[model samples]
Target: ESAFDLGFIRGMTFGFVGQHGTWGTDEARASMRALAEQPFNWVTLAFAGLMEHPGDPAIAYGPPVTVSDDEIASMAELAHALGLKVCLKPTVNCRDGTWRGEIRFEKEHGPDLESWEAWFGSYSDMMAHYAHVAKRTGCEMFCVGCEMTTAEPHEAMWRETIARVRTEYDGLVTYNCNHGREEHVRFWDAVDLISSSAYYPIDRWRDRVPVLREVAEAHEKPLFFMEVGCPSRSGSGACPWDYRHPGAVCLDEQARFYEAMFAAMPDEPWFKGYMLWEWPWKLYPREAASEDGSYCIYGKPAEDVVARAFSAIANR
Candidate 1:
């Protein structure tokens, strides 16, 4: 089996931040290609074409960047060859609080919703464009919106977005509303399941298990933690990039986070799966948790824990 029955939530960075669809760099592609052998089986290729977020981790250093279609295909091909299911998301950069990067037409003016409205054509054009990319690249999973919770309060937008994407991309549809954003109850009508980032650290949500229980009690929706990562304690905040809490765990404490979370949220009848925070460009230095600088399930303590705890599932 490529992964556990729920299919571990996983991803490898395919493009530079801010650069949408810039194809792949040899280094980037080669690095991600190797990740196929790791426990990660889900991949992420972000670009401005699907949705754009300003000042995100991808653009924490700059503005938006575009990616080439050819590079995208190569990535998809690599992922499929390795038995990975792909997820293409429409995302707005999120490096800060309450900031959704890719702009909708209504948000161009600022308080600029009207000028933003003018950009509606551009938004749809990009979605349609990404739809084609996902279709042509053999992406198995498609996320129509990323943390646009505020913008997607209603079902109309999702219905239209889902319809538009379905025309070109025939695959599973997931709406990743980012962390902190509640699941879009309405959008569930349009997507296969609900996905959200599980960045809530132990200190922040001392009772995370209760929340998982709440999620389990909800609908029969297959809820997936599309994103789950903790920052090594350099600072404090609920945001993903924010520092780990002052009372943050040491390496053992961090390990406990996963141990606790997994123990709390495993194969519940409704809980589908999870994707840890990530595996970045290999060139980047490894963090304290990862001897190899990735949060994925291979070399890190969390990864080892995952393999051990989920051996029955992952090794099945």
Candidate 2:
């Protein structure tokens, strides 16, 4: 089956734009072109941080300074040149230290849920900027919202937000609700696919049996675990992102978890694919020996299971 047929665009993703390094623009463009040639032909552009308006307290979810219009344009143009598409999303908590209190819309407008319209108005403006970028570059998909669990009570307002997006932007849209918090499932009918970040702790569950089953049976809509991975650490034990009980997950346990999940998910027809949590945690070759770069699968044996399962979806 074609990548499009399987709902897989050979996706590879890079999550943070705020951490642009020495050769930033070249890296972004090169990364886009590079990933397009690999198993991925689509990429997610995490524009990084909440761009607060000048001297205003409210945070705007747009491209942060690390990536400029020229940079984004160049990256988008290169990806398009290579027959790839970009998924633009505004998010916090993906990367450490970037989207802290500073990237919040409340910072500018102050905490006033009673006047939530004003807050969503800021998000609307952010979407407008995203629309401009999408229009300018002809990106394939635009993400409507990233994880905001505390704000689930604002569904009606979000429905309005979705309407605004459909009214303004012509591209397909998806929302990324962080790990297991797919609060916007009610809005799935309004959006394209059912998308969410599913970061299950490998050691904690020999099989994410019930949860995966729940998602599979939840509806007939397609499923995409936009983010899924455990934090890499040395030796045995669970860490913060894993959020599992101590001594629950080690490297071997993680490998076992991946295998079990792969084995169990295929029976369900609604499943599409998942983007592994990350890559390039501390550059490929290695720097100082650090636990920070290792939790995600690279060339390990566990990857074989993931690759095999991923291949099966295409064959189906």
Candidate 3:
């Protein structure tokens, strides 16, 4: 049902960077050019809207903090020019240090609907704005939200938000569920695609396949791993989601993860592809690849693993 004909989306997310205006710089353009050398056919541009507290309902997307609308559009345009399909992924985070998954009101539907209603209104407004940007910039897909675990139970709110998003965008719509919560989402049947983060332990890839397959089949929706990658640090495989989990710089661990993951996922009918979890706009020098401990795979052995895997996937 997607307007675009992109099949088997081999993508990499340009995230955890460019929170402000770094995405518009010359360095960012160079980074984008470098990314094109990889085999990925898609690039997801991620930015965030912040709320002061998870308990509160309001959201903020402004300058010197959030990436400006102009920068987002330009990045989408740049990605398209680089022959990569664009997916604008607008995420939510808390300025008060709580995760977006913990975002909730005390009595959302009880007596005070005001808090929840106002919250969704803010979220929907952000979606609508990005929808227009996605449409105008020719983005192929629009991600409504990412890992907003606490918000998923408000089924009606999500439906309304998706509807609001489509008022401006006619392309594919998706929501990135946090890993292991795939079956708990109440509105998978409403979006065009079912997606989730993939932060499973090193030995846990294959087991998660059937778990996600059941959800996708139950919803009768095509699915993909919207975010997947391990950092180039030791113990990352055991705690992939904990980017700050410290250890020795083990580039081979990340490389082996890609090798294992690519071997784990087969070409299934309901499976589309994976958007690997992060490459920053401001890249470290190629010489520092061995010392870097972040999730980015640039200049590391994982980059070659990814390139070969993506090429192999594009084949079958």
Candidate 4:
């Protein structure tokens, strides 16, 4: 019943690198080729949709900004041709600029048919649409949802949604919870793998990994970091998730964070692998990496750390 091995994912996320709404283009293909040369064997192509806010009742997904379905399928095909497995992660973001983790609704008498019911109804439809695309494009995995923190307690709705996706996508399925929310997800049994965004502090992994390992073991599923990265700023090692953390540029901080993670990773059997937060579809000039404070590892010293770590994992 398994479509492929769910071993270490060893991946990177490709996002908003080229012109919006354009995939399978020359620029996109070139970026994917560049990704192929990296130490990654898996790549996540995220097709993002939009909601008005966390409490909004509707979701809007279309072309021009969100790539067309045909383009998504073509991009998956291109990644496979380049010898990389793909994970189709259809994401929903709030138009009001709220993080997806903050997306939630009232448990009280708030709206018609209840807010949760309305939201999940829209969400499941969107997920099912991408699930079909995942099947047709032969993607190895499909992420059901990402970082819907407040909604994790709605176990029944999520289970139903995963069941719906299973009917459409025969590949491995997983849900991406935020870093600290891993233990709170009551329905880990519904998915094949357990994943969380591993954005803990540089020093926290030594303690945190064992805790996360226990969570995965309890669910009897392999665990992996669905999204993980540190920015090249001085204080980012302590707060990697804060994109706007104030500090001077320190490339070694980012490099050391990767080293710390890779060093501690071998100690856990359940800690399968990580898909680093991102690699842009459009890369900035390498010379400007020092000035850029984003999560991108493109031309920074952190890139070498990542490559070396991924290579070591591959050899093992």
lDDT of 3 by residue, 1-316 (tens): 4522349889999955458878878878888888888898999998888888887777788577788888888788888888999999887788878988888886665333547777888899989988998999988899998988888989998999999998999999999999988889999877888999988887898888887888878988888989999999987888888887989999999988888888888777788889998988888889999999889999899998988878987766
User: lDDT tens digits, residues 55-172, model 1?
Assistant: 2122211123455566667777877887887877655544334456243343433323344433343445567677888988888777776666545654664576678888988777
Ranking by lDDT: 3, 4, 1, 2
Model 4, 110-160: lDDT tens digits are 436448888888889989999999999999899998888977988888998
Candidate 2 lDDT, tens digit per residue, 122-229? 667667676677767887777877665644456786787778877767777777776556533566666766676665554544455566546545654566766555
User: What is the lDDT for 251 in model 3?
Assistant: 96
**What TM-score do all the candidates reach, one by one?**
0.75, 0.73, 0.95, 0.93
lDDT of 2 at 4: 22
User: By lDDT, who's the top model here?
Assistant: 3
lDDT of 2 at 11: 55
The best candidate by TM-score is 3
Model 4 spans > 4 angstroms off: 1-5, 16-19, 22-25, 107-114
Candidate 3 contains a number of clashing pairs equal to 0
Superposition error at 94 for model 2 (Å): 11
